[PDB]
Amino acid sequence: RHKILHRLLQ
Amino acid sequence: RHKILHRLLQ
Amino acid sequence: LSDEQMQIINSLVEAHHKTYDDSYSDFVRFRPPVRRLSMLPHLADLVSYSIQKVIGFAKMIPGFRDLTAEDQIALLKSSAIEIIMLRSNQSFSLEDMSWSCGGPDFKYCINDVTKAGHTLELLEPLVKFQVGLKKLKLHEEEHVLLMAICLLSPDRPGVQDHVRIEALQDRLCDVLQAYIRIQHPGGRLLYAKMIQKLADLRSLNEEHSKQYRSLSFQPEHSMQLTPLVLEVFGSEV
Amino acid sequence: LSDEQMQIINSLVEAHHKTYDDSYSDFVRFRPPVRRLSMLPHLADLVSYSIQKVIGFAKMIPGFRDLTAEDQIALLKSSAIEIIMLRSNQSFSLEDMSWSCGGPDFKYCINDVTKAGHTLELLEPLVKFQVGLKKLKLHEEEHVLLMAICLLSPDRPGVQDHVRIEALQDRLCDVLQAYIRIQHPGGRLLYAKMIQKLADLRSLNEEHSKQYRSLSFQPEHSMQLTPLVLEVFGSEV
Ligand SMILES: CCCc1cc(C(O)(CC)CC)ccc1-c1cc(CCc2ccc(CO)c(CO)c2)ccc1C
Numbered sequence: 002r003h004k005i006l007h008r009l010l011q
Numbered sequence: 012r013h014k015i016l017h018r019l020l021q
Numbered sequence: 022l023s024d025e026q027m028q029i030i031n032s033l034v035e036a037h038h039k040t041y042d043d044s045y046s047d048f049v050r051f052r053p054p055v056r057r058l059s060m061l062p063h064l065a066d067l068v069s070y071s072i073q074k075v076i077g078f079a080k081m082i083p084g085f086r087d088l089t090a091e092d093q094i095a096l097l098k099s100s101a102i103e104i105i106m107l108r109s110n111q112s113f114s115l116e117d118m119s120w121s122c123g124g125p126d127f128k129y130c131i132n133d134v135t136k137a138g139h140t141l142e143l144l145e146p147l148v149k150f151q152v153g154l155k156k157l158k159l160h161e162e163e164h165v166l167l168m169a170i171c172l173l174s175p176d177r178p179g180v181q182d183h184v185r186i187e188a189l190q191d192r193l194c195d196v197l198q199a200y201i202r203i204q205h206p207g208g209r210l211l212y213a214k215m216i217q218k219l220a221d222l223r224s225l226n227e228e229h230s231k232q233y234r235s236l237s238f239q240p241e242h243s244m245q246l247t248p249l250v251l252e253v254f255g256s257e258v
Numbered sequence: 259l260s261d262e263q264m265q266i267i268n269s270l271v272e273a274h275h276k277t278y279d280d281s282y283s284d285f286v287r288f289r290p291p292v293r294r295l296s297m298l299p300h301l302a303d304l305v306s307y308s309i310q311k312v313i314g315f316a317k318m319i320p321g322f323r324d325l326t327a328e329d330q331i332a333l334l335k336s337s338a339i340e341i342i343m344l345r346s347n348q349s350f351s352l353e354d355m356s357w358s359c360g361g362p363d364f365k366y367c368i369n370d371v372t373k374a375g376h377t378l379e380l381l382e383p384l385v386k387f388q389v390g391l392k393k394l395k396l397h398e399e400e401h402v403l404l405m406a407i408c409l410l411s412p413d414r415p416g417v418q419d420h421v422r423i424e425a426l427q428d429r430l431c432d433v434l435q436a437y438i439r440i441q442h443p444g445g446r447l448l449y450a451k452m453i454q455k456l457a458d459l460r461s462l463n464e465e466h467s468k469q470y471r472s473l474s475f476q477p478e479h480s481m482q483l484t485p486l487v488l489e490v491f492g493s494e495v
């Protein structure tokens with residue numbers, strides 16, 4: 002979960 | 012799972 | 022042909038017309054085309070849109086509606102890409118080796134499609150398939166049948182009642198085989214050709230699947246897809 | 259103000275500029291506006307797009323980047339709608355009581371927004387909020403601060419280190435309080451007004467949440483959303 006939020010937060 | 016496919020299949 | 026056979030033809034043909042807009046007027050509502058995967062937004066919407074049509078078509082194939090909700094999803098999730106490769110042919114032009122949909126913005130060369138995340142490994146046989154198929158110059162009656170035959174294949178991962186679906190597909194294969202014999206002059210070897218196509222859609226299905234996982238795995242690419250595409254092409258069982 | 263304080267201002271302001279296109283040139287790539295929830299596709303893309311900007315802005319707030327990946331998501335998932343209601347104000351016009359973004363197609367009356375699935379229960383206070391806020395005629399320095407202050411609230415469901423985030427927010431509240439005292443003439447009562455706004459964004463946050471669940475629950479409506487919107491507004495913990 003939150004796969005997309007991570008990619009964007011790095 | 013397959014929430015959208017059901018709605019469309021009825 | 023008999024009456025029952027013909028009724029199935031009129032049934033499939035009307036379902037196709039109801040799910041295939043020859044004006045392609047709905048394309049104006051997809052995220053605009055752009056010629057770094059610039060064509061992904063537009064094509065992901067074109068495909069998401071198409072899936073909705075395939076589901077609409079499937080719901081009208083005589084008998085399909087009577088399968089188990091699970092069998093319906095199983096047949097759909099696995100044969101969706103194939104049905105879209107089949108229905109797309111109705112717009113493939115041998116001339117400009119592209120898909121012409123109403124206008125120039127909606128005309129996709131092998132170039133445009135490359136910017137959607139797919140390589141030639143798929144695009145190569147895909148076009149080859151479109152040409153070979155486009156050349157069979159099938160009738161709308163046969164065209165719509167081939168779609169119903171492909172969609173009602175019992176040899177799909179997930180199928181429970183892989184015996185009833187075996188019946189339906191057969192009931193369709195006959196109508197086609199018969200029609201081609203009676204209504205299609207010069208088509209004394211057609212059936213074999215068509216069935217051969219359903220086999221090519223299998224290698225293509227596979228290729229797209231691998232290429233799809235590759236993209237699908239990247240959130241900067243999957244966030245570009247649609248909730249429906251992710252679900253139908255997703256591997257959640 | 260001190261140097262450290264000022265550095266934070268230059269930091270936030272540059273982050274805003276980098277994440278806010280005054281040309282609104284990217285709107286041409288959203289699914290076209292349509293005036294049965296006709297405005298959902300376009301607005302869902304406008305919002306999905308905005309979330310991407312808020313994440314981009316957040317990653318530049320000094321200190322935020324040092325929070326736990328989980329704290330980052332927690333602050334983001336819960337304060338995202340509020341930041342979007344705050345940043346949207348930079349385009350809200352008191353004249354035509356709408357959001358003017360570059361052109362007429364990208365101008366949304368209270369009418370257009372209704373066709374997005376939201377009722378007046380939200381649209382009513384939302385506009386009221388936009389007016390009251392638009393009237394404070396804040397500076398870009400204060401505007402960008404209020405966003406960082408709102409985003410770095412420790413009182414959000416999910417926050418683990420609700421004590422460090424307590425520090426950061428404070429380090430920001432000062433810079434603002436100070437600036438308003440020194441750099442904002444006539445703004446001897448501003449701070450209190452602004453903070454009052456962060457409280458109104460809470461009732462609005464709530465309203466949108468309920469209204470969002472209602473829509474979100476319907477697949478014929480959620481299939482219209484974006485993978486990013488579903489995830490950030492979804493309740494998956
Ligand atoms: C069969 C390949 C379908 C496909 C999937 C994808 C994705 O896998 C990317 C992640 C999913 C959105 C991207 C692009 C394409 C793709 C799409 C087309 C579009 C064919 C186009 C699609 C459908 C239809 C009617 O349903 C017409 C008109 O008859 C034209 C041609 C070639 C390719 C490679």
Ligand SMILES: CCCc1cc(C(O)(CC)CC)ccc1-c1cc(CCc2ccc(CO)c(CO)c2)ccc1C
Pocket residue numbers: 301302303304305306308311339342343345346347348349350357359371374375376380381384466470473474483487
């Ligand atoms: C805060 C309400 C945000 C919202 C959420 C939704 C959904 O909940 C529907 C399912 C998610 C897509 C639909 C519509 C809206 C909604 C969106 C707007 C757009 C404001 C618009 C949005 C963002 C920005 C910059 O990030 C500008 C220019 O500064 C203008 C105004 C009013 C409403 C009610």
